[PDB]
Design a protein around this ligand. Structure first.
Ligand SMILES: Nc1ncnc2c1ncn2[C@@H]1O[C@H](COP(=O)(O)OP(=O)(O)OP(=O)(O)O)[C@@H](O)[C@H]1O
Ligand SMILES: Nc1ncnc2c1ncn2[C@@H]1O[C@H](COP(=O)(O)OP(=O)(O)O)[C@@H](O)[C@H]1O
Ligand SMILES: [Mg+2]
Lengths: 440, 897
């Protein structure tokens, strides 16, 4: 059943095709890492963790929801299945009706969906059933394969994540972009060299040398343990070869859809005042990246905010704090620079400039007590503490922060109706896909 | 031969580098000496071109010796290395290798100084002595160092004088512009910092105001060098006055400090013993180092808030050795912002017009050219590169940035290790969201910092520039100009080529600058400039909208040029109508200031006639000779228009346009000294063909070849575009060109008929026949016939205005053929024969592309619209009497086989 689902996803998009070697390797890894039902449960968790990273966010939640549906329909009774069907129906706006009262999880999801929290309802299945997730690092670490390919939408790249992975594993990359004869020749020479004594190689934009990819890369993957190959492709580009794709692990790098998760990621990617300014910058970047995905009302267009903007704003903050030791830090200067220079260069519309200026005014007000989100308040640093204690305090105040189910509107300070429209459209598409998928 | 003898036959210890090439040179020298002796008493050129193949590595090493040779062609490299003792061929390449330096002043085998493009003279601190045995690169290196040292010495002297308390009006007449600029800006930032130490700003505001008034008063009585110097100092001093006024209007101290941190501040170190690195430029906390390269007297940019924010983001990008990226629509000030930033940082920015023909090797060669020099690279129109090339050069750009950040000495690009100068940087300016342009991959876009400049501040630019010419009323006039442009953009028919951004305003200012000599500094001048720039590009109803709005928002001889155009039209046979002469006036007044012009209209509307007769009028008016190089754009491939690099041996083959540009640049025979050169692109305006000329069309006036050559565009070198529609033409091409729109035909039917008859008669007693043919073309019946022709069904639909070619040519040719039997008949018979023949010609010229029934209908209507001899469906003339086709059929008896 899971295998048929996976080839249905492969029918949906050319990047999501699944071979039998990967699935059987996953089945072996299940035993590598009431007994038959427990084996089934570990199978479900391992296959979800492995094949979630090969899909973008909508297909992630689609597969998570239909897989939890399959498992619980096997385990539970018929009334539970009818309740799940009618709750997906009211999620899909196809069948409207209250589910039959019986345990407790269904009540939680009923409270999630009656409060018009569609995103919470979609992600509640990931919250409850699947208790593990895999990033790029976990995929590369837990793979016996020798070759990797990475796919992402245009105007977003995960090359810096692979660079961070290489620095974490104390390896060496060799960025060889594709597109010209000299680059192809140097790629062949480096491939031979790093096959005969090891080392990592990363190939950029492999969908732009498709003839070379179809010949040389196919015949080389077809035929040192400290050697790895990374490839970068686009989801909306040309069709990569199926025999090449099924022999390489596939990872889809997309921005983290959460807010507190983005703050935690940017905080884990790293005097006292530099730590405070880095914390505020990470919060600002997470909030603006959460806001930029609401196309019609969050911004006037679709804007990208990558690690380069965070790096440049952090460098500017360090430069200001080092060159102003009098501790009367010019918050107006920092606000104007970040809202106008670093994060505002990409912005072309004046209303979006106004809203980024308002966001910078909210996050960099320079007050002793700042309520950056309606739940969490951060104090200013004292004059008798150190860097380690400040980092511990800010990590503790991040851990105690709990993201509510209404964080897409209240945290971004936006009207509810646009959030209702966006979440309703997203949930309707996801539930229509899983209703077309689950019945067959 | 001279180049070969210079590189090998004259220099000592230079033949041992390549002994095989030395032997080949000796054999060719013997053969050519024998040939020259035989001539003094083909194969040689082929042998020379063969032995240039081994000279490629020698030239590459020579370019490694002096890195600025990368901006020169191989032929120019041969010329400069072969200049063993002449020492004049080297001076002609100063503009190619430096950009701001035109030639070197020589005085009795010694270097006195260098001269800028604008005529400014920079005198070196010490004269450079040249010996016979020295080759080019050593004394070019020491001249390069001496230019920077001289610029610093002049800056230090001017800054000491300004610290001494003297007025700037006495020092502007003594030093170069860059020294005055840097010293004045250091004094300005020191005085503003001292005023910021207190709460007092009004006294320095008054001081700066009366300094500006004194400079404006002394402007009118100064030489052209002093005129340009004073104008640039007014640009900078108006920036000073705006900043001081903004600081005075500030309510509190903290916002005053923020506003001060938002603006450039040029300081000077007092402890470092290195003279060339004593000046550092501060902005928003960051510090950038001056380079003291010779700049000259450029056309300085008005310091708009958008320009200041762009400078801030460029400084923020270059503090981490990243790239500068500017994205937005056309005519917004991206490349000019980059160039003004470079001129503020004391170095000439080298601009590259990227193209689809720029493959990985070409772009990487330009990268190793500019990183070895240390120059700043403005990759103009970076979208035009292919996506594969954009992906491929990402590694090279990343290596450049990594070497700049980590302070590495060498970088490995194109399989060769070359030194990395630490003063280099990369800038790109691109226009997203246009048809037929590639998209930058994210792995490349993460190496640049983009900054949107969609909306410039045209009001401030107009106000300050009109103040610089010295208009009595500037604020109200600039506000009226900007409001007029906005309401003209809002109240006109929204067709694709109506663009009213910054470029047309700036063209209005360039047209108003030399028009005050005849209209005076006032509102009449600006309304005349507005007419002369904007009216030729508007339609018919939009012309009425323009006139009504001009009368609403603004209150309000050239006989010689009209006489010259009338004479030219009489010689060419055209008719000086109202519309034709209006288009001639529009083209002449628009080309008087604008170099590149696009002529747009229907097929056969009068474009070629217009520009040919205006060129004839200019030639007969000024007396200057004129050459025209009409190039069919889409007939030739891009590799045949600009040139292609032969990948077999990495040589450059000139395209047609580049060959014409090189021929007009070199000027071997001296005949292009006082001539105007028009190059006409009589084809469709393909974006891929004419956006490779983007740096050519705008104020850069330079053609960036793939092989690094930088051919300057002479002022007397104008480009004409002759097309039919602007459906696929991007606004980047439209705004750079003064457009001339042909809404209707410039010629009436009768005038076209008369012109065709006179031209055909000139292309051939004759007087009586010509008079009878002219009288036979009865225009009163002709217009009815032409109006009745519009009701037919036509295959290969052509308007009836352009069928007069066929009719007139057929009639004249058939009359000339029948002229043999025209001396033995009566006048009435001749008139009837000519009338019948012209009726047949008109039938087969107008309805000849119609069916049999339609041709019968048309021959009936041409019979009833003309006593005259009746033309039938099978009427003909036999050897001179009327007959039919029935009696002309020969009997045919075909055999079986
Ligand atoms: N003022 C005029 N007086 C007489 N003849 C004229 C006049 N203007 C145009 N013509 C005639 O119009 C005809 C077509 O015009 P013209 O040669 O200018 O075409 P064009 O603009 O070059 O067309 P295309 O779209 O083919 O480039 C020519 O034969 C020319 O003689
Ligand atoms: N202060 C100024 N700021 C911006 N542009 C100016 C200024 N003064 C004059 N200009 C004019 O604006 C034009 C800028 O062209 P630009 O937009 O840089 O070309 P591109 O679109 O290729 O970047 C130039 O033709 C220049 O004459
Ligand atoms: Mg540009």
């Amino acid at each position: 059943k899971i295998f048929s689902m996976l080839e249905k996803f492969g029918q949906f998009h050319w990047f999501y095709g699944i071979s039998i070697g990967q699935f059987l390797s996953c089945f072996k890894r299940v035993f590598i890492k009431t007994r038959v039902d427990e084996i089934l449960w570990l199978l479900y968790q391992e296959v979800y963790c492995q094949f979630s990273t090969a899909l973008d966010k909508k297909f992630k939640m689609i597969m998570a929801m239909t897989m939890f549906c399959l498992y619980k329909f096997d385990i539970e009774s018929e009334q539970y299945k009818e309740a799940v069907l009618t709750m997906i129906g009211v999620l899909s706006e196809s069948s409207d009706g209250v589910p039959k009262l019986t345990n407790d999880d269904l009540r939680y999801l009923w409270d999630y969906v009656t409060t018009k929290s569609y995103i919470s309802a979609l992600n509640w299945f990931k919250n409850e059933f699947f208790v593990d997730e895999w990033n790029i690092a976990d995929v590369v670490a837990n793979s016996e394969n020798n070759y990797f390919t990475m796919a992402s939408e245009r105007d977003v790249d995960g090359t810096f994540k692979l660079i961070e992975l290489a620095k974490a594993s104390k390896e060496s990359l060799k960025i060889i972009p594709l597109g010209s004869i000299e680059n192809l020749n140097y790629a062949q020479e480096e491939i031979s060299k790093s096959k005969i004594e090891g080392g990592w190689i990363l190939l950029q934009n492999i969908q732009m040398s498709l003839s070379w990819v179809k010949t040389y890369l196919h015949k080389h993957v077809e035929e040192h343990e400290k050697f790895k190959m990374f490839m970068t492709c686009h989801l909306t580009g040309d069709k990569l070869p199926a025999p090449l794709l099924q022999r390489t692990d596939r990872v889809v790098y997309e921005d983290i859809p959460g807010i507190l998760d983005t703050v935690k990621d940017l905080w884990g990617s790293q005097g006292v005042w530099s730590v405070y300014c880095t914390f505020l910058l990470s919060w600002f970047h997470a909030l603006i990246t959460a806001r930029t995905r609401l196309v019609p009302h969050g911004f006037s267009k679709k804007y990208y905010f990558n690690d380069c903007d965070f790096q440049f704003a952090s460098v500017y903050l360090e430069n200001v704090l080092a060159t102003n030791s009098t501790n009367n830090i010019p918050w107006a200067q920092v606000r104007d620079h970040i809202a106008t220079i670093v994060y505002g260069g990409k912005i072309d519309e004046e209303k979006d400039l106004e809203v980024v200026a308002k966001l910078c005014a909210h996050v960099f007000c320079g007050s002793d007590n700042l309520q950056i989100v309606p739940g969490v308040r951060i104090p200013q640093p004292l004059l008798q503490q150190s860097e380690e204690e400040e980092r511990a305090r800010l990590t503790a105040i991040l851990s105690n922060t709990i993201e509510p189910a209404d964080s897409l509107s209240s945290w971004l300070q936006l009207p509810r109706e646009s959030i209702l429209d966006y979440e309703r459209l997203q949930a309707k598409e996801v539930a229509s896909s899983t209703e077309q998928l689950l019945q067959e | 031969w001279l180049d070969l003898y210079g590189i090998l036959g004259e220099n000592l210890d230079i033949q041992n580098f390549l002994p095989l090439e030395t032997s080949k040179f000796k054999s060719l020298t013997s053969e050519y000496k024998m040939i020259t002796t035989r001539a003094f008493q083909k194969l040689t050129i082929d042998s020379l071109k063969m032995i240039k193949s081994s000279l490629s590595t020698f030239l590459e090493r020579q370019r490694r010796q002096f890195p600025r040779f990368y901006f020169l062609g191989n032929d120019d490299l041969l010329k400069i290395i072969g200049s063993g003792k002449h020492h004049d061929q080297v001076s002609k390449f100063m503009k190619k290798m430096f950009g701001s330096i035109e030639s070197i002043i020589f005085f009795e085998d010694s270097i006195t100084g260098v001269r800028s493009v604008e005529g400014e003279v920079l005198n070196l601190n010490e004269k450079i002595e040249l010996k016979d045995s020295i080759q080019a690169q050593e004394w070019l290196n020491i001249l390069d160092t001496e230019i920077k040292l001289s610029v610093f010495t002049q800056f230090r002297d001017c800054l000491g004088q300004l610290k001494d308390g003297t007025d700037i009006e006495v020092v502007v007449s003594k030093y170069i512009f860059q020294a005055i600029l840097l010293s004045a800006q250091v004094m300005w930032t020191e005085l503003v910092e001292k005023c910021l130490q207190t709460n007092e700003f009004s006294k320095y505001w008054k001081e700066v105001d009366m300094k500006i008034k004194g400079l404006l008063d002394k402007l009118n009585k100064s030489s052209d060098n002093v005129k340009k110097k004073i104008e640039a100092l007014l640009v900078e001093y108006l920036h000073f006055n705006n900043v001081i006024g903004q600081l005075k209007n500030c309510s509190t101290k903290e916002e005053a400090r923020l506003l001060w941190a938002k603006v450039q501040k040029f300081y000077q170190k007092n402890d470092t013993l290195d003279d060339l690195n004593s000046v550092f430029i501060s902005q928003s906390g960051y510090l950038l180092q001056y380079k003291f390269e010779y700049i000259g007297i450029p056309e300085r940019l008005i310091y708009t808030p958008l320009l200041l924010v762009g400078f801030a983001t460029l400084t923020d990008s270059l503090h981490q050795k990243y790239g500068g990226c500017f994205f937005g629509p056309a005519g917004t000030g991206k490349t000019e912002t980059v160039k003004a930033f470079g001129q503020n940082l004391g170095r000439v920015v080298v601009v590259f017009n990227c193209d689809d023909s720029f493959d990985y090797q070409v772009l990487s060669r330009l990268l190793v050219g500019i990183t070895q020099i240390g120059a700043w690279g403005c990759f103009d129109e970076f979208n035009r590169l292919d996506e594969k090339v954009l992906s491929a050069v990402s590694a090279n750009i990343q290596q450049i940035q990594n070497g700049l950040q980590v302070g590495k000495s060498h970088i490995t690009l194109l399989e060769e290790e070359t030194p990395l100068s630490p003063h280099t940087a990369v800038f790109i300016t691109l226009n997203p969201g246009y048809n037929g342009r590639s998209e930058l991959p994210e792995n490349l876009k993460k190496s640049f910092r983009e900054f949107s400049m969609k909306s410039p501040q045209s009001g401030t630019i107009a106000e300050m520039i009109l103040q610089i010419m010295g208009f009595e009323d500037s604020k109200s006039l600039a506000s009226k100009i900007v409001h007029f442009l906005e309401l003209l953009s809002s109240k006109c028919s929204s067709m694709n080529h109506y663009h009213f951004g910054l470029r047309t305003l700036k063209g209005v200012l360039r047209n108003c600058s030399p028009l005050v000599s005849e209209f005076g500094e006032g509102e009449k001048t600006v309304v005349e400039s507005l007419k002369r720039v904007i009216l030729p590009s508007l339609g018919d109803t939009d012309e009425l909208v323009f006139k009504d709005e001009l009368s609403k928002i603004f209150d309000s001889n050239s006989k010689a040029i009209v006489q010259c155009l009338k004479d030219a039209g009489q010689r060419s046979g055209f008719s000086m109508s109202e519309e034709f002469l209006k288009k001639c006036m529009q083209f002449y007044y628009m080309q008087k200031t604008q170099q590149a012009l696009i002529l747009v209209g229907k097929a056969g509307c009068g474009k070629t006639a217009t520009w040919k007769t205006v060129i004839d009028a200019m030639a007969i008016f000024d007396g200057h000779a004129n050459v025209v190089y009409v190039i069919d754009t889409k007939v030739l491939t891009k590799e045949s228009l600009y040139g292609s690099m032969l990948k077999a041996t990495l040589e450059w083959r000139d395209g047609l346009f580049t060959s014409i540009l090189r021929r007009v640049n070199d000027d071997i025979t001296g005949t292009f000294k006082n001539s105007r050169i028009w190059v006409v692109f009589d084809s469709d305006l393909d974006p891929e063909y004419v956006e490779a000329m983007n740096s050519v069309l705008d104020d850069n006036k330079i053609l960036t070849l793939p092989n690094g050559e930088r051919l300057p565009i002479p002022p007397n070198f104008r480009i004409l575009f002759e097309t039919d529609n602007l459906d696929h033409t991007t606004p980047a091409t439209i705004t750079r060109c003064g457009l001339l729109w042909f809404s209707t035909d410039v010629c009436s039917i009768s005038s076209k008929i008369d012109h065709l008859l006179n031209k055909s008669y000139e292309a051939l007693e004759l007087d009586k026949l010509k008079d009878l043919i002219s009288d036979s073309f009865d225009m009163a019946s002709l217009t009815n016939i032409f109006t009745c022709s519009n009701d037919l069904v036509h295959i290969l639909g052509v308007r009836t205005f352009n069928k007069l070619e066929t009719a007139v040519q057929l009639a004249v040719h058939l009359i000339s053929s029948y002229r043999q039997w025209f001396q033995n008949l009566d006048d009435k018979s001749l008139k009837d024969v000519i009338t019948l023949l012209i009726k047949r010609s008109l039938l087969y010229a107008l309805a000849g592309d119609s069916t049999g029934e339609s041709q019968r209908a048309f021959i009936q209507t041409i019979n009833t619209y003309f006593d005259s001899q009746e033309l039938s469906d099978y009427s003909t003339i036999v050897i001179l009497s009327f007959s039919s086709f029935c009696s002309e059929i020969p009997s045919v008896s075909l055999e079986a086989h």
